[PDB]
Amino acid sequence: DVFRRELVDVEGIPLFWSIAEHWSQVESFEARPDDILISTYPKSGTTWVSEILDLIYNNGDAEKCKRDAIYKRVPFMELIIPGITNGVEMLNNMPSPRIVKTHLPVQLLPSSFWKNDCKIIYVARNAKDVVVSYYYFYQMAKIHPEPGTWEEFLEKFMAGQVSFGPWYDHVKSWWEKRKEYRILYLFYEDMKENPKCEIQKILKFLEKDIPEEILNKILYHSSFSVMKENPSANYTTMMKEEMDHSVSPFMRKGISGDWKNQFTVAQYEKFEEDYVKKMEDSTLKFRSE
Numbered sequence: 001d002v003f004r005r006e007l008v009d010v011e012g013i014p015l016f017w018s019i020a021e022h023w024s025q026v027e028s029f030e031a032r033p034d035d036i037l038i039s040t041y042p043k044s045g046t047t048w049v050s051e052i053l054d055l056i057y058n059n060g061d062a063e064k065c066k067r068d069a070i071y072k073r074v075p076f077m078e079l080i081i082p083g084i085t086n087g088v089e090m091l092n093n094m095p096s097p098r099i100v101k102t103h104l105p106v107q108l109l110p111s112s113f114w115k116n117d118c119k120i121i122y123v124a125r126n127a128k129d130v131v132v133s134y135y136y137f138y139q140m141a142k143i144h145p146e147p148g149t150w151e152e153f154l155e156k157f158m159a160g161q162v163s164f165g166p167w168y169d170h171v172k173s174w175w176e177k178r179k180e181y182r183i184l185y186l187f188y189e190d191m192k193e194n195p196k197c198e199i200q201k202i203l204k205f206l207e208k209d210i211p212e213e214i215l216n217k218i219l220y221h222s223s224f225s226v227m228k229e230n231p232s233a234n235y236t237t238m239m240k241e242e243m244d245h246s247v248s249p250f251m252r253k254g255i256s257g258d259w260k261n262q263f264t265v266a267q268y269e270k271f272e273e274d275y276v277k278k279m280e281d282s283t284l285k286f287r288s289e
């Protein structure tokens with residue numbers, strides 16, 4: 001049974017057992033100079049930005065972006081599961097320009113990305129909305145260990161005892177890295193408030209100038225209401241054994257501020273006190289609504 005196993009430490013970070021088992025394959029991954037790396041802590045808008053990028057690469061052509069599921073169009077690099085998937089091999093066999101997905105903390109990223117000076121798009125999301133999203137995802141996505149109760153999961157998240165480690169360190173270190181490498185550091189909340197502005201930021205970063213009409217096509221097809229019903233983007237092509245959408249759909253709510261529905265007032269106060277301590281010596285700023 002490849003599912004519901006305990007996580008395994010990889011260079012200080014809890015990762016899926018099968019990633020740990022094939023870690024040298026991940027470490028030695030060969031990047032290319034024109035790779036675009038989408039890098040996120042889980043549940044921060046990875047799929048959203050991946051679809052945006054594939055739409056940009058295909059000039060807003062919805063049908064071309066339905067050539068395969070998002071997880072094949074934009075391979076999850078480090079995800080290797082025997083008998084199921086191998087992100088490294090998928091990417092190895094993919095023609096340039098490649099769009100690459102990762103959740104790896106900066107210190108675990110394969111060094112080839114740095115050596116190739118790749119452009120990176122990092123997406124961050126407010127911690128409270130992340131942990132709620134991750135809770136329901138743990139329930140539906142069976143590769144994860146059992147999340148337990150909301151209360152138990154919240155404590156694990158605060159302690160960084162979840163897949164890919166602590167959110168706090170993930171966002172902070174990737175933020176610091178923007179001074180060393182070409183990292184467009186985006187916020188889920190900004191994409192909610194003004195998706196046009198954020199997609200324009202992506203286009204400028206990619207050194208692409210496109211017609212307003214194409215920009216509008218990309219905006220339309222990357223909206224939550226469109227993506228949630230799109231079988232090429234909504235993960236419903238996954239086997240039920242891997243992801244059970246009847247437990248919780250991947251495209252769950254797609255809002256900012258769902259944390260209010262999940263956190264008790266006491267949990268919120270405790271979380272905030274802990275958060276300020278972990279984040280006060282970083283210039284990184286978030287919005288929660």
Ligand SMILES: Nc1ncnc2c1ncn2[C@@H]1O[C@H](COP(=O)(O)O)[C@@H](OP(=O)(O)O)[C@H]1O
Nearest residue numbers: 043044045046047133222223224251252253254
């Ligand atoms: N087009 C879109 N607009 C807004 N949110 C989106 C989106 N596509 C996916 N999401 C949300 O992004 C989260 C998944 O992130 P990731 O792709 O990094 O795993 C989920 O959040 P919720 O669980 O809060 O709904 C999902 O609903």
Ligand SMILES: O=[N+]([O-])c1ccc(O)cc1
Nearest residue numbers: 071076079084085143242
């Ligand atoms: O099988 N799975 O659970 C998967 C496979 C590929 C992917 O990128 C994400 C999850």
Ligand SMILES: O=[N+]([O-])c1ccc(O)cc1
Nearest residue numbers: 042043046141142143144
């Ligand atoms: O475990 N999983 O199946 C996952 C985990 C993270 C992710 O972004 C996609 C799929």
